[PDB]
RNA sequence: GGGAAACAACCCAGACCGCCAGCUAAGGUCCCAAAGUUGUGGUUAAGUGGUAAACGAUGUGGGAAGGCUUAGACAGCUAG
RNA sequence: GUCGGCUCAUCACAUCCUGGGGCUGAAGCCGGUCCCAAGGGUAUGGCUGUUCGCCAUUUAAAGUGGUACGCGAGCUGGGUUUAGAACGUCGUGAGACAGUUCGGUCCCUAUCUGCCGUGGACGUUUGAGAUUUGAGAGGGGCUGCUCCUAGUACGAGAGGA
RNA sequence: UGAAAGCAUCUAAGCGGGAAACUUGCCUCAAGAUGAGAUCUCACUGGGAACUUGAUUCCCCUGAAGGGCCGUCGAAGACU
């Protein structure tokens, strides 16, 4: 496991309250808790964390890599924040955010009002550009997925909510 | 010549078993064998010489493998197409005592004596039971 | 999705994946290459 | 019926039926199961002495 | 929470537009709370009411003591209503004012009893040929099963038997008029039972 | 007779009678239901066990080889 | 006790409609194919004994099967196998045809199981008059068209969400 | 989200969305649910003897709450 053998470098300003398996990490943006799997060696020696497997079965070998990946996502989270860019394509497709409610205009006969959960903030620098911000990578990806779920991109004009780096497959009528 | 247990002079004890963390079938065999009196030298096949078993923490019984979602309890209502099925997991959430009760009932004889032995099994959902006046002795298998 | 007894990679971008005990082929290039249950 | 009662009586003494019968052959005890089942119910001290004699013979 | 009334018959209401509303008139004499059932005592929340009158000779001593505990007069019957977070004390008068005109109600009653009914009337079975050679089997059920497989009649088979005289609930009836001065409730349409039959009016489930 | 749930023709075994004696056969020994919740070392995760083929698949265990490789192997990233 | 019809069904899913989806040689409208799904629903006539089929006109659809090719101690008796008669054909003939045709007796008061209703007895641990919880069970669950959204999205237009 | 497999991956750990199918929600039946449940209220507060001494039997006094019979009936009903 090249991932579990790669230690996660703790930056400046991250505290830990490692108690048994309930790891916790704080930062300038928030605090997150992780219940580490009871088969993964997690310990702290310096401003750095490394992960090992208590028993080399196979599930624990994968568990160590996934725990290392999760903790790194935690460390990057509380220190920098995670973001997902969403673009809106199509005439009359507008998105506007008012606090904890995102209002989408996606060619429907009703108003699309999405309630962002706690810890997630959405900004719309343009009427056709969404910006989900948060400290938990899973929640940021989850929220961005449901917003794109309202109108996924179509292959004939690209219209619909899409990720900024998403390669929207395109085609045309023969 | 061979001894037989008279129903009038059967000594019956009360035991409480904690089902928390126990495998359903392996706990049900001990319960079924102690409801039969097979642990007693006075065992008679036509006499209920067994003890009373109180089971607590019934929802905390466990099944190995993928049996939590895969073990299915079927019954028929007598009406055409009346076959009904429930999960182990959803039966535990709905009628947790029925899970232990079903596993013991299939392990008892299917006759009047087996229904008599079933009447000595008391299964409860909480960590407490109403039979404190009988002072059950804890029986950890 | 194409559901057949014999699923296999139809191109380089096709990937063999097991999900919940089902052998699946997903393709990042062609949605037409999606297969199931091999 | 005798074997079941001997099993119940011997398990109260730390032995299964199969281990007790093997022990009762290692130590040459020819008490049959009808009498053994009568001891296990009516003469429990006598039955305990026999079980201990089988346990010693096994090991 | 509902009320216990008597079906007083059917009439019509003419609106100023000229529309005729068929109404069932329900006389809801004020209902007396006989006993309030709480969770900590009975396992569930309910209110027990009585309505009407009963001559003292037809009231048993046990029922008379039950009524005297609530300090209410004996009624022709006693009914219960499952409750939410409502609070009632014995002796309260649940009158027809808990309803307002225009609101949906469910009316429950005992439907008219038709006695032993044939399959044509009870289950809408089709008649067989009245002519063309049919022997003595014009209204009879026909086949009641298949054959050797399954060699029996299935439970719940539609057969002839008793029809009516059972508890029926008609749902989503509009209140046309609430006449609190005469303890009258006018609901649009028909309600189960005959005139003089006990009906229960409750707010609509749907 | 015993086993194979039930089951002429399969398996063990050929019933003169009685016994509230013992040993075995086939088959078995968690409960129904007599007897190991026996011991040691592995495999399976599919309730496979406890029904089936051509064919398909980074399921997983073992073994014998081979190619590249700290003169930088494979994968990823940058650039041509 | 046979084919078909009538009455009444019950189950399967290899689904006809309705529901959810993937791919499309899927612009839209409409389709094609496959996966999931059995809750409910799923023609009326003309001809023919017909099942079928063809035709007419509907429908969201007019599903495929099992159930003694479900169902005659429930009905029918058109077909099919009695005895009459006839045609064609075969046989010298008596007759015969799996060819045609006109006519031609369909019994049973339900004991048990079962089912639909409706009581009596006892039990529920003193008895009684009321009210009740709900383990459980059964019933129900179909769908069209029009309008707004909007002649908007889509489209060269046509058409058209 | 995410490793095993530095990438990828809905899955292995973890977190979702999701159908007239299933469990409810609607309606009716329902404690013979022998596991026979719950609540309110009502009624009955005497002696003697005996045997095979106690959840026994017999004699006298007592006969409640209530139920039924009977009658007048019913938009209830084959009889009930
Ligand atoms: Mg048996
Ligand atoms: Mg899934
Ligand atoms: Mg009537
Ligand atoms: Mg007709
Ligand atoms: Mg006739
Ligand atoms: Mg006739
Ligand atoms: Mg007639
Ligand atoms: Mg049968
Ligand atoms: Mg044999
Ligand atoms: Mg046998
Ligand atoms: Mg045994
Ligand atoms: Mg072992
Ligand atoms: Mg199997
Ligand atoms: Mg390289
Ligand atoms: Mg299917
Ligand atoms: Mg159907
Ligand atoms: Mg449903
Ligand atoms: Mg036709
Ligand atoms: Mg005509
Ligand atoms: Mg048939
Ligand atoms: Mg028949
Ligand atoms: Mg007839
Ligand atoms: Zn491909």
Short mmCIF file of C-alpha atoms (C1' of nucleotides) in Angstrom, two decimals, chain H:
data_model
loop_
_atom_site.label_atom_id
_atom_site.label_comp_id
_atom_site.label_asym_id
_atom_site.label_seq_id
_atom_site.Cartn_x
_atom_site.Cartn_y
_atom_site.Cartn_z
"C1'" U H 1 -15.89 10.02 -0.41
"C1'" G H 2 -12.48 6.08 -0.99
"C1'" A H 3 -8.42 2.57 -0.93
"C1'" A H 4 -6.91 -2.65 -2.00
"C1'" A H 5 -4.09 -1.46 -7.19
"C1'" G H 6 0.66 6.10 -5.92
"C1'" C H 7 -3.95 6.21 -11.19
"C1'" A H 8 -8.93 4.75 -11.77
"C1'" U H 9 -13.16 2.87 -9.21
"C1'" C H 10 -20.87 3.71 -6.34
"C1'" U H 11 -17.85 -0.52 -2.30
"C1'" A H 12 -14.09 -3.19 0.32
"C1'" A H 13 -14.96 0.69 5.58
"C1'" G H 14 -18.33 4.87 5.51
"C1'" C H 15 -22.46 8.50 3.53
"C1'" G H 16 -26.59 9.19 -0.16
"C1'" G H 17 -30.73 9.57 -4.18
"C1'" G H 18 -34.19 6.26 -6.05
"C1'" A H 19 -40.58 2.89 -8.61
"C1'" A H 20 -47.98 1.88 -9.00
"C1'" A H 21 -43.77 -3.51 -6.36
"C1'" C H 22 -42.69 -4.29 -0.09
"C1'" U H 23 -43.87 -1.92 5.34
"C1'" U H 24 -47.18 1.79 6.80
"C1'" G H 25 -50.64 5.75 5.91
"C1'" C H 26 -56.99 5.01 4.11
"C1'" C H 27 -61.29 1.49 5.30
"C1'" U H 28 -63.27 -2.95 7.84
"C1'" C H 29 -62.62 -7.21 11.12
"C1'" A H 30 -59.83 -8.37 15.21
"C1'" A H 31 -57.61 -10.86 22.82
"C1'" G H 32 -60.22 -18.57 21.16
"C1'" A H 33 -53.72 -12.98 20.43
"C1'" U H 34 -55.39 -20.30 25.24
"C1'" G H 35 -49.72 -15.25 24.73
"C1'" A H 36 -57.39 -15.53 26.10
"C1'" G H 37 -54.55 -8.11 27.00
"C1'" A H 38 -56.34 -2.92 29.28
"C1'" U H 39 -59.60 0.76 31.67
"C1'" C H 40 -64.08 2.73 34.49
"C1'" U H 41 -67.88 1.07 37.51
"C1'" C H 42 -71.12 -2.32 40.21
"C1'" A H 43 -72.27 -6.69 43.51
"C1'" C H 44 -71.88 -10.35 47.36
"C1'" U H 45 -68.77 -9.26 54.54
"C1'" G H 46 -73.84 -16.62 57.49
"C1'" G H 47 -73.74 -20.71 60.53
"C1'" G H 48 -73.19 -26.41 61.52
"C1'" A H 49 -71.26 -31.18 60.72
"C1'" A H 50 -68.17 -35.04 58.53
"C1'" C H 51 -64.59 -37.92 56.01
"C1'" U H 52 -60.52 -40.62 52.63
"C1'" U H 53 -58.11 -32.69 56.55
"C1'" G H 54 -58.08 -27.67 52.62
"C1'" A H 55 -58.64 -25.12 45.70
"C1'" U H 56 -62.73 -31.32 50.08
"C1'" U H 57 -67.74 -32.87 50.97
"C1'" C H 58 -72.65 -32.43 52.93
"C1'" C H 59 -77.02 -29.71 55.63
"C1'" C H 60 -79.71 -25.25 56.78
"C1'" C H 61 -80.03 -19.84 55.95
"C1'" U H 62 -79.15 -16.69 51.93
"C1'" G H 63 -80.10 -15.71 45.98
"C1'" A H 64 -76.76 -9.85 45.15
"C1'" A H 65 -74.80 -7.18 40.73
"C1'" G H 66 -76.56 -9.05 36.57
"C1'" G H 67 -78.38 -12.47 32.77
"C1'" G H 68 -82.26 -15.15 30.62
"C1'" C H 69 -87.25 -16.89 29.89
"C1'" C H 70 -91.93 -14.39 28.63
"C1'" G H 71 -94.43 -10.06 26.19
"C1'" U H 72 -94.81 -5.36 22.62
"C1'" C H 73 -91.63 -4.81 18.64
"C1'" G H 74 -87.70 -3.01 14.94
"C1'" A H 75 -85.17 0.94 8.98
"C1'" A H 76 -82.30 -6.16 12.86
"C1'" G H 77 -83.42 -10.88 10.87
"C1'" A H 78 -83.84 -17.85 7.39
"C1'" C H 79 -83.84 -19.73 12.71
"C1'" U H 80 -80.56 -17.00 15.58
#
